[PDB]
Amino acid sequence: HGFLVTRHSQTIDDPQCPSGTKILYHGYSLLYVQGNERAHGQDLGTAGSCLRKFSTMPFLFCNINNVCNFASRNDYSYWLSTPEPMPMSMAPITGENIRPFISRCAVCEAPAMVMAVHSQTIQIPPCPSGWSSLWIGYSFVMHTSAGAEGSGQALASPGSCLEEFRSAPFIECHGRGTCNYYANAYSFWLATIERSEMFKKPTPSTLKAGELRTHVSRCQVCMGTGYLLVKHSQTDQEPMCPVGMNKLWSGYSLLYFEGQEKAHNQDLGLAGSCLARFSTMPFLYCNPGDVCYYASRNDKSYWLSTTAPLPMMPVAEDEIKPYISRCSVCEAPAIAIAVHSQDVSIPHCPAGWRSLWIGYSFLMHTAAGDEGGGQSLVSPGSCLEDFRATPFIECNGGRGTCHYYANKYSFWLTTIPEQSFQGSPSADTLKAGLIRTHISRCQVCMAPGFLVTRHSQTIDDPQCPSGTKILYHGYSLLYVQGNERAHGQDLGTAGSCLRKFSTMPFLFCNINNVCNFASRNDYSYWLSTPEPMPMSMAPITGENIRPFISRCAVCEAPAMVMAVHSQTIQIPPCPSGWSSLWIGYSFVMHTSAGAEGSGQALASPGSCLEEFRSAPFIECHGRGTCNYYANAYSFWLATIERSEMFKKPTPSTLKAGELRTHVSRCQVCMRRT
Amino acid sequence: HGFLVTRHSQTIDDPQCPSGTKILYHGYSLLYVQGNERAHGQDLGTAGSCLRKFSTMPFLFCNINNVCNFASRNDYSYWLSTPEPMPMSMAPITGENIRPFISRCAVCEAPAMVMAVHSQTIQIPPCPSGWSSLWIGYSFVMHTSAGAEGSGQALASPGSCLEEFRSAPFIECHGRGTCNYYANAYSFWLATIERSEMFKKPTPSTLKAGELRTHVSRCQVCMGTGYLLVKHSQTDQEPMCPVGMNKLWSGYSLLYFEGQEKAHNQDLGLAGSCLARFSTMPFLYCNPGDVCYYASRNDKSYWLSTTAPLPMMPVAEDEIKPYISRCSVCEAPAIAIAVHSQDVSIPHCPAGWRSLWIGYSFLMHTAAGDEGGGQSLVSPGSCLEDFRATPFIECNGGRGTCHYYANKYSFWLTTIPEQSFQGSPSADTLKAGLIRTHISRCQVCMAPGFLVTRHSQTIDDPQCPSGTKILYHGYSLLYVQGNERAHGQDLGTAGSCLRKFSTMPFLFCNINNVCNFASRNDYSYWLSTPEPMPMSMAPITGENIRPFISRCAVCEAPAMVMAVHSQTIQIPPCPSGWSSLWIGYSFVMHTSAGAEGSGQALASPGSCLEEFRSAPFIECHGRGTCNYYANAYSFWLATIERSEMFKKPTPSTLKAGELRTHVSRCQVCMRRT
Ligand SMILES: [Cl-]
Ligand SMILES: [Cl-]
Ligand SMILES: [Cl-]
Ligand SMILES: [Cl-]
Ligand SMILES: [Cl-]
Ligand SMILES: [Cl-]
Ligand SMILES: [Cl-]
Ligand SMILES: [Cl-]
Ligand SMILES: [Cl-]
Ligand SMILES: [Cl-]
Ligand SMILES: [Cl-]
Ligand SMILES: [Cl-]
């Protein structure tokens, strides 16, 4: 069916594909990139973390004036690293001296899906019954470096299970060709939690060389038939698995971690959002000097919550339990997806598809600072059965307490009374019994196969590619920005294809159970068409917006689909056993207002746009206006010569007529069945 | 008395000192720097914006392991620029080709204080009666570039009045030696506002070459005897000036602007916080292509507010007026300062000092996103007569509406029952009649002369320097971090010298009139002593914190004091007419948790620390713990060879025994009287 597993050696040698899997290609271990000071990661369990060609600057950026710049500002790349020591000078490494520092990786095709399980103890967690073992490791969850930017791993992804513990598991590289370790490069790991300690104030620990792994959770990567379904009860009782679905485990509903004031979220539809053991501080962090700190600074955790009444002051220890939502992870015979109506009407499941539950369209959230995160709209995690203005609670780390604070926001897709296009939303403030008719509805449904999403980048619906069948058409949503926090929908997922357009397709709700729609200064971003910008350069409003918005198709596929990238001007061939759906250009990330943005998974078809555009997306506002602004940046994978991988990038500024000469090419492929 | 004015030519030629002033030195126009992705600006009206030696990397950073790195990561510097065109290649500029792009400046000594006034029309505002004119210009307020980081000008500073309008008034440089213009380099200007339009929804305008200056406010820089006192009524009536103080103007209480999701604040004790004409969008912005946008995106403004009752929905147009606090700017015979008690007791004014009012210690604020700002604790702007859990209102730009949202926080210095040292704060949640006894009190008092603040960086009180007299001693506060936003107290100001220490010297209050003290995950930062870090490297608690905290003295001076910096290993001589108070090392900025931080004004004695330390400050938490963490970074001005100013910086990594070889030296000087 085309499942993939990616393995990282954390040495200069290629890792072997785990028993029962077969090699597709090898590469270098890409952790994340940082462009215009915004980080965008690649999950280490996915093929996008494995790049065939290294470079300290593997991407470039383009502006709306059709000018692209390569290695010509101040951007970063980050790579998993080897045991190689820092040179005694502690000065940045350049050229071929970089090579001994970069981890290698393997992309392998598995016969069945692959996941990680975590013990939250020093013991190895066993694989689920009937699942086969691929490797064991240490629970790696997130990381931060320059600017305290960073990214993290999904806790059910193999990428959260590193086979070698390192206080310094990654190295920082710069567009100018330098790489080094820096004292603020932090690695975050799941900590060991005793069941008896779950609802006690954490005992802080400062750990040094020789005792570090004593507090690091262990993991095992496992392969098994079927798929995973995750349910969150939003109550203090574990949910029941649907009829016929064996339960793997129950736990506590984890929404996100905050380390160094940087959120790292778990998708509520994935098993990483269901943690078996609760703590107000379930992780620790290490600096590169082999010193780790558990519950010894000012970090926090966030959990989906129950209807337990708002406390007057923070709750401590065992008073926390009634507040924490519970979850169950279940073995499913097919992949569950969410469908959203953007309407008062509940959306029906497609004909023949088994329905699992009905809910409300939960999109994103913010709390302390402007940190937060959001859900994938094709994930069941975006469909909460119970609407709640405040669906999560904050747990303040080493304090051992949890509380509701006034800056907690939830964001929900809105109902839209128009059949499909809302260019001029009307602001409103909603309370009490007037809220729910403005919250989009959803249903979670079991799909018979797989989904491929395609974007025309024109006003015309795209055709479904060969071997796939249309499910629905819509508009190309790139990301949203709520309360100054950006949240994307991967362009390879059905969440980037919305049946209804609005310049403001969401609203937000506060601790006082008041919701505000199109009343503040929030944004939506959409892939756009070749429609020329107006000569006036003034914002576009209302019905005049329609010619600018790209259309999309969501299609049913008989097998899995992926993107591969050449990092050259040549088209990369599809892997053996895979056939071609389309070709395009390697699209990595983007920023716009406030330098916020999002990006694509490099193994996702969403990182392979069929039409190169220096300005591939348009910015819209709750005010009912859209425009192209001069700070809209698109980032693409750069072309790299194998012989020059480790040499200093040669900076280049490209103009119209030579843009696509330095843009990596890609192909989208589906496993032949 | 030693007043200074700084002028920027915006060309390659030295500007002339304005009539009635005399030249001290010339240099290059430094706008801001960015280190570890955090921006720190120098107000263009101050001598710290005028650096004798240019470099694309004029600073270095040091970590707690006594290792310093120069031009060896990925940092930035920004400079006011000339009319020089971009090269046709649009590729980064290097080497001597940079020189034609950098503005020159002059630092001049004035016989009296200097300010800017703004018309908010296309007409030149007249100088106040009895004030003499120095130059006229255009109202320049803030700017953003890479990462949408940036900084801005105080609206009563000459730095807010640029003599030449430019859509692209500054250029971006990098540690690697490159400089260029980028499409996201935004300049923000005060807009023209008709009195009849003040409380109407803004009319958006997209402006192109040939009509840009039609919407740009004009300004005049003026010199006059005496000082300025600013009062905010916190009501819809203008405050009366104190007896004997002539009123210059009345206006509306401006707290901050938000452009590109980056706050730029006005000090509530300075005349820039009193804007004569209100608008929900009082500024516009330009990109470097000579295209400007007024009320055409998603920016906002924030104002001090009244007791007008919380509206159920946003208020529009003329319903806004009852909500906006009013202000008056008054001519004062001496400089008013705030003194804070950190106690239930109201602090008395020093003997002989005229008292102006009594209030509560207002420290900082956050609202949309995590943006916000704060007050200087020696400024009367930190002493609000009326405590308010929500002392400001948000105005949503081009919507033309204002509202109170649930994520608005105010932060206040706390009362502390200990005589001077609180190492273990006890968390509490406060409501209704139990709040006010926990809010520090203040009094605003007219000082007979000037103030100099000195830090011992030891547990011993420093001596007041020659020619000054002790006023009080305290502890060295570097900055605070509330709701993930950092807010500093310049080390050359009395606000960095607090009579009482706490790991959590503040609390925050929410829209529901509930205050939370030491209950979440906030921070305070203090200059520290030579006390060794514990071998255990574990956090320090309670009374054990005392040996680590630096002491300070606030002293009365007969004249103004400044810092000068050599950018070499040699001590810079005091200017002619000025005598030496102490020598030290050029200290620019710092970051710690979350890569947040603050910095010093380079003309302030706070940028001249007498003891160089790679780890000059310690991090404390509301939990009652303090520690040195590996991501604590100190940034210092680097040494620069005049012949190599425009050449590529040579990167250097320095170890113990050679740290001070690349650290600029400074001297603190007082005008002889
Ligand atoms: Cl770069
Ligand atoms: Cl470092
Ligand atoms: Cl912690
Ligand atoms: Cl709160
Ligand atoms: Cl909005
Ligand atoms: Cl723009
Ligand atoms: Cl650098
Ligand atoms: Cl650009
Ligand atoms: Cl605007
Ligand atoms: Cl709100
Ligand atoms: Cl706290
Ligand atoms: Cl640390």
Side-chain angles (χ1 to χ4, degrees), chain A residues 86 180-184, chain B residues 61-64 67-69 73 630 633:
Chain A
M86 263 177 108
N180 210 355
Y181 290 97
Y182 294 91
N184 70 339
Chain B
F61 69 88
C62 304
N63 68 34
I64 69 170
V67 176
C68 304
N69 273 275
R73 202 171 190 168
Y633 285 131

Side-chain angles (χ1 to χ4, degrees), chain B residues 4 36 39-40 50 71 197 199 227 237 250 309 323 345 393 436-437 459 502 554 590 604 610 631 645:
Chain B
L4 303 176
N36 191 30
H40 174 55
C50 194
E197 280 280 294
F199 298 92
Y227 308 93
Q237 300 263 91
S250 281
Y323 286 90
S345 310
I393 194 169
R436 262 159 190 73
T437 55
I459 59 167
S502 180
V554 174
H590 51 261
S604 167
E610 297 179 64
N631 66 348
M645 287 187 296

Side-chain angles (χ1 to χ4, degrees), chain B residues 223-554:
Chain B
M223 194 173 53
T225 72
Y227 308 93
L228 298 182
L229 169 73
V230 185
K231 279 191 95 165
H232 297 277
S233 67
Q234 304 178 263
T235 74
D236 64 358
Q237 300 263 91
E238 338 175 317
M240 276 178 33
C241 286
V243 296
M245 308 204 175
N246 180 246
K247 188 156 92 175
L248 294 191
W249 72 88
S250 281
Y252 302 83
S253 305
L254 171 61
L255 189 73
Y256 65 110
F257 294 159
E258 206 176 351
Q260 282 303 295
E261 279 78 40
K262 176 72 167 51
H264 176 57
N265 292 256
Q266 300 298 317
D267 185 308
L268 288 171
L270 301 180
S273 71
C274 194
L275 207 62
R277 302 189 180 195
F278 171 92
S279 175
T280 59
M281 184 38 62
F283 57 89
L284 57 75
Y285 85 88
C286 304
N287 67 50
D290 274 349
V291 171
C292 305
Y293 286 107
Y294 173 67
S296 294
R297 211 166 173 172
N298 240 352
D299 291 331
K300 46 199 142 193
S301 62
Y302 288 90
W303 307 78
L304 229 45
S305 63
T306 70
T307 58
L310 169 59
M312 299 303 104
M313 311 178 316
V315 293
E317 308 220 312
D318 286 69
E319 324 171 292
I320 296 165
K321 288 193 257 236
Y323 286 90
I324 309 301
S325 166
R326 314 289 137 97
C327 48
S328 292
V329 177
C330 317
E331 281 179 311
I335 298 163
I337 69 160
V339 291
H340 301 270
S341 66
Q342 300 172 272
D343 201 81
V344 297
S345 310
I346 287 146
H348 300 269
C349 289
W353 298 29
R354 175 177 174 187
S355 164
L356 299 182
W357 68 82
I358 281 151
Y360 296 81
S361 306
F362 182 43
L363 176 63
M364 67 176 275
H365 56 264
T366 70
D370 64 346
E371 289 297 313
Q375 306 309 309
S376 160
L377 286 174
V378 71
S379 173
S382 66
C383 196
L384 290 183
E385 282 202 53
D386 292 350
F387 173 79
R388 312 268 177 82
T390 316
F392 65 95
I393 194 169
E394 174 171 324
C395 293
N396 290 108
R399 294 199 178 273
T401 62
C402 309
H403 200 28
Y404 290 98
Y405 295 98
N407 60 351
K408 286 181 176 59
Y409 283 129
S410 59
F411 298 72
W412 306 77
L413 281 187
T414 46
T415 71
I416 287 159
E418 287 90 351
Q419 310 309 321
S420 92
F421 195 90
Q422 184 182 80
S424 313
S426 184
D428 206 2
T429 301
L430 308 164
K431 312 185 179 192
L434 299 173
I435 287 164
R436 262 159 190 73
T437 55
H438 293 272
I439 317 292
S440 170
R441 300 313 296 280
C442 48
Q443 191 154 202
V444 170
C445 315
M446 310 262 294
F450 304 90
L451 296 184
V452 63
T453 299
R454 192 177 193 183
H455 300 274
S456 70
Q457 298 168 271
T458 69
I459 59 167
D460 296 315
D461 293 333
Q463 290 191 341
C464 286
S466 293
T468 69
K469 177 35 134 171
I470 186 52
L471 191 76
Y472 73 87
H473 297 105
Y475 303 93
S476 302
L477 175 66
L478 187 72
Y479 67 114
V480 301
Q481 192 164 346
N483 188 38
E484 312 195 354
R485 166 122 191 150
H487 173 56
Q489 299 295 315
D490 186 284
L491 290 175
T493 67
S496 67
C497 196
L498 289 191
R499 288 187 198 81
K500 307 200 186 190
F501 170 88
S502 180
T503 68
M504 185 38 59
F506 59 92
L507 56 68
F508 65 86
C509 302
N510 76 16
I511 191 84
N512 291 339
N513 294 290
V514 179
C515 302
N516 272 285
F517 169 68
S519 298
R520 206 170 183 175
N521 294 106
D522 289 328
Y523 312 71
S524 68
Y525 298 87
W526 306 75
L527 289 188
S528 57
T529 70
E531 188 68 22
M533 195 180 170
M535 178 267 287
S536 76
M537 316 202 262
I540 309 142
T541 60
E543 172 62 34
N544 292 321
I545 296 169
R546 199 191 297 259
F548 294 90
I549 309 301
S550 166
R551 296 284 294 171
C552 48
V554 174

Side-chain angles (χ1 to χ4, degrees), chain A residues 404-422:
Chain A
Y404 290 98
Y405 295 98
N407 60 351
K408 286 181 176 59
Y409 283 129
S410 59
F411 298 72
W412 306 77
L413 281 187
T414 46
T415 71
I416 287 159
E418 287 90 351
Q419 310 309 321
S420 92
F421 195 90
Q422 184 182 80

Side-chain angles (χ1 to χ4, degrees), chain A residues 34 37 72-73 88 172 182 208 258 261 296 394 396 399 484 520-521 523 535 629 655, chain B residues 34 37 72-73 88 172 182 208 258 261 296 394 396 399 484 520-521 523 535 629 655:
Chain A
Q34 201 171 339
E37 311 222 299
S72 300
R73 202 171 190 168
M88 209 183 316
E172 171 181 314
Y182 294 91
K208 297 162 159 185
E258 206 176 351
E261 279 78 40
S296 294
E394 174 171 324
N396 290 108
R399 294 199 178 273
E484 312 195 354
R520 206 170 183 175
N521 294 106
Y523 312 71
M535 178 267 287
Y629 296 99
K655 300 168 170 236
Chain B
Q34 201 171 339
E37 311 222 299
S72 300
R73 202 171 190 168
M88 209 183 316
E172 171 181 314
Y182 294 91
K208 297 162 159 185
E258 206 176 351
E261 279 78 40
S296 294
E394 174 171 324
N396 290 108
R399 294 199 178 273
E484 312 195 354
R520 206 170 183 175
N521 294 106
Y523 312 71
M535 178 267 287
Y629 296 99
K655 300 168 170 236

